[PDB]
Design a protein around this ligand. Sequence first.
Ligand SMILES: CCC(=O)SCCNC(=O)CCNC(=O)[C@@H](O)C(C)(C)COP(=O)(O)OP(=O)(O)OC[C@H]1O[C@@H](n2cnc3c(N)ncnc32)[C@H](O)[C@@H]1OP(=O)(O)O
Ligand SMILES: O=C(O)CCCC[C@@H]1SC[C@@H]2NC(=O)N[C@@H]21
Ligand SMILES: O=C(O)CCCC[C@@H]1SC[C@@H]2NC(=O)N[C@@H]21
Ligand SMILES: O=C(O)CCCC[C@@H]1SC[C@@H]2NC(=O)N[C@@H]21
Lengths: 176, 353, 176, 168
Amino acid sequence: KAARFVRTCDAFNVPVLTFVDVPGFLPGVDQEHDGIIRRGAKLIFAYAEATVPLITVITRKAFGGAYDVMGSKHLGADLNLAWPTAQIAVMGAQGAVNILHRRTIADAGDDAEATRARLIQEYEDALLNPYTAAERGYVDAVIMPSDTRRHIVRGLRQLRTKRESLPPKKHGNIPL
Amino acid sequence: GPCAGGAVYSPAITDFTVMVDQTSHMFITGPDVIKTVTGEDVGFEELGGARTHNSTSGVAHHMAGDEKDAVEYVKQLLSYLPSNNLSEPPAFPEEADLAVTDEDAELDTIVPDSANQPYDMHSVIEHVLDDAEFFETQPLFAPNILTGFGRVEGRPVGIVANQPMQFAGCLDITASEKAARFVRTCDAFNVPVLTFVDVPGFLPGVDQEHDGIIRRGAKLIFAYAEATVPLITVITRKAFGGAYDVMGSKHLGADLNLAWPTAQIAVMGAQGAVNILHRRTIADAGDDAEATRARLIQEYEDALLNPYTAAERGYVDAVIMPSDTRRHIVRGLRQLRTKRESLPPKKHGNIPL
Amino acid sequence: KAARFVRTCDAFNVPVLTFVDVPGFLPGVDQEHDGIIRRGAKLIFAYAEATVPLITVITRKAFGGAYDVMGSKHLGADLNLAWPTAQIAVMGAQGAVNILHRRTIADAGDDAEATRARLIQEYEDALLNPYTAAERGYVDAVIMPSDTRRHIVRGLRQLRTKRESLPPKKHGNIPL
Amino acid sequence: DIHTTAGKLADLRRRIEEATHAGSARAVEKQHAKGKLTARERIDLLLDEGSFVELDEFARHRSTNFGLDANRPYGDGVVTGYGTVDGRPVAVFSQDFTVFGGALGEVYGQKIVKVMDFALKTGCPVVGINDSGGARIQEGVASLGAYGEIFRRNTHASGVIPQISLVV
Ligand SMILES: CCC(=O)SCCNC(=O)CCNC(=O)[C@@H](O)C(C)(C)COP(=O)(O)OP(=O)(O)OC[C@H]1O[C@@H](n2cnc3c(N)ncnc32)[C@H](O)[C@@H]1OP(=O)(O)O
Ligand SMILES: O=C(O)CCCC[C@@H]1SC[C@@H]2NC(=O)N[C@@H]21
Ligand SMILES: O=C(O)CCCC[C@@H]1SC[C@@H]2NC(=O)N[C@@H]21
Ligand SMILES: O=C(O)CCCC[C@@H]1SC[C@@H]2NC(=O)N[C@@H]21
């Protein structure tokens, strides 16, 4: 749905504003068997291909590949803003700790949980925010929610003269 | 090997993906997560194994029995493509002998008398390609249509053909998407596309409609209409309704459209046609309700179920003897190799997704 | 005269309006010997070459090749209008009947004429009009003479953004 | 038969024979008597042996004016296709005077447009062999439309691909 809309806007020089709050992809055998791999890739293609102004605002969740897909700076987004409530991480705290502390948690069968529970809590209070991404410049700024309109308006003013182009080709070979 | 999470999207964008049976897996979400979220209990192999992605998801283009074979397959793939879109595909020119061989003759009898009795389109394809060599892609996905590479006079060509042995050659969602991507792949890399037609129409089914056959089936027509590389189409038998238009018809931009005497190019089947054109004629004379329509059906089929009306209008450039197909394709490509065409200027198209 | 004017307008992006009322070409041995074939072809070249907006109005006569020459739609004219008084036909009724009914008229030496005279009359009342051309779309519309100005004004408004180009070449090889 | 594959091939062979001999025997006789060759004999002289590939061989007119639909000869009065001249690609059309006096019709004209589009598309020369009494009057303005489309092609292809007119 979004992939074709993005391409439509791009083909007709319409700037695209994206608001992110995605925990990831909807789990399910049907999703896999129906080709989520090639069909979901259509959205990243649309964004990476787009040469119109691109402004992205992460209001909250942004985990794993979903983060990349939702008009991330890595795809070519010109301006990426994030709210203090944004959670930009490789994956959920629970899933991350079960890996990073798999051995540290294995110790003491007793007190199994509470140990990883605390670890999960520590991981989210330390990484479930937009500051690591901000330190790397993945997001151009962490803003107050109320300043979103101001950022979008000033951003579009400068970006309206954006000039970019992809390598010469008859056309792309977007997944079908 | 494994390819999980957003990582799967990188191969998805590449032109071709080759996997190894019982050794490679692709999936956005693992069994453990889907298990706790959907309750579904599935193993890695079933979820995203080589076979699954080669015959169910339509994401993989080939499943090799081992890594050595997989690497050999990629080398084969590269041998048919140029190094970049600025060059024609790698060629090894050699003038073919256009004299009618005993093999060419076989084509005149390959189509059975019974319009129902199927035949292997693979045979047709092999008879026109150098060394009868056909390099197929996505063999396990949408078997109702065939896609692959070959060479004509040492020059790489792409192939798209309906397979009468599967779903009677009917088109459907999977076949449309399979062929659409392949055609666009060939076009982007300056590879000519040869299409063989034998399609009675689209696979009927509520699921086909609900799953979006309208926007997905359109991908194939878009592909053909977009293509600027040489396009030669051969209609061996059935070609009805929109299916006819979709399968590299001249209306879409096909440069050379050939039809065998056995070709059937019409709007729809005889029955469906007569029931409408003579609905009022047949309504009368309840006596002998049948035989009166069976006659009308017989007249309609013997009068329109052929390629001569299309030939009259030039929809097909010629009605040829099956045995002369190779000759036509060879001489056609020789002239078409200098084809220069372009579409209206644009950043890109807006193909249905 | 017209050929060079048309090319002049085209080279300088000037739209060309053409009003047609031509019975054909001026008969004469001199016309042939002086090269009407290569010199008359200059006008069709001019029109077919032109990429500026082209609006043609057939007020009356338009027979044979003359019809094609006078900015016909077949040459690339964008808008072709015809008045009810227009006569768009392959040739004059008399010349047409002497061919189509050459045998039917040969019969009965007596009543020679009056038979073809009637045939000529029937041919002109049936074909000497712009409706066959209108059925084929050769003319975009048959209009009331008084609506010509309205059609030209609205036509030019839309056609002003016309974008067309011929195949790449150093230049053409117009007849000389 | 006819309902069998072999019967359809035999059927094709018959149509081929009818198409390759569109003009009547007396018509061809009259042509040869005027010291003129037939449309197909001229093409055989121009193109390299066995290089000729005919297009729209079974084309037929769609007119019903003045009983024209009484006779619908395959090819509709003009032989067209492509081949090679001295080993080089060439597009060609050869008007058939033995058919309707070679009078240019709608389909007839459309066939010439196809060969011209082929030549422009592939970038090869166009050899036009002309032998026509004029416009096919029965088709009325439809013949004028055909001429016009051809003129337009002539102009667009001018200085792009060589165009030679053989008037016989
Ligand atoms: C867009 C990307 C997404 O979709 S989200 C990322 C999805 N990827 C994964 O879940 C797994 C990634 N990589 C893997 O190796 C996985 O198979 C996992 C499950 C993480 C492997 O876990 P496992 O081997 O059981 O425990 P461990 O890796 O849990 O810890 C022990 C040693 O393994 C190493 N390791 C290697 N790769 C990773 C990784 N990707 N993440 C975390 N640790 C990894 C650890 O560093 C550790 O080694 P060491 O002590 O640092 O020398
Ligand atoms: O959507 C969820 O909340 C469930 C988690 C499963 C989604 C997978 S984790 C790897 C891949 N990367 C993502 O961002 N989402 C999927
Ligand atoms: O495939 C069949 O034989 C059944 C007919 C239903 C397919 C529909 S008819 C309209 C549309 N045009 C086609 O060629 N196929 C579909
Ligand atoms: O101009 C006239 O009224 C006399 C008729 C002769 C003109 C010839 S007929 C063939 C050619 N096509 C035309 O439209 N005009 C000339």
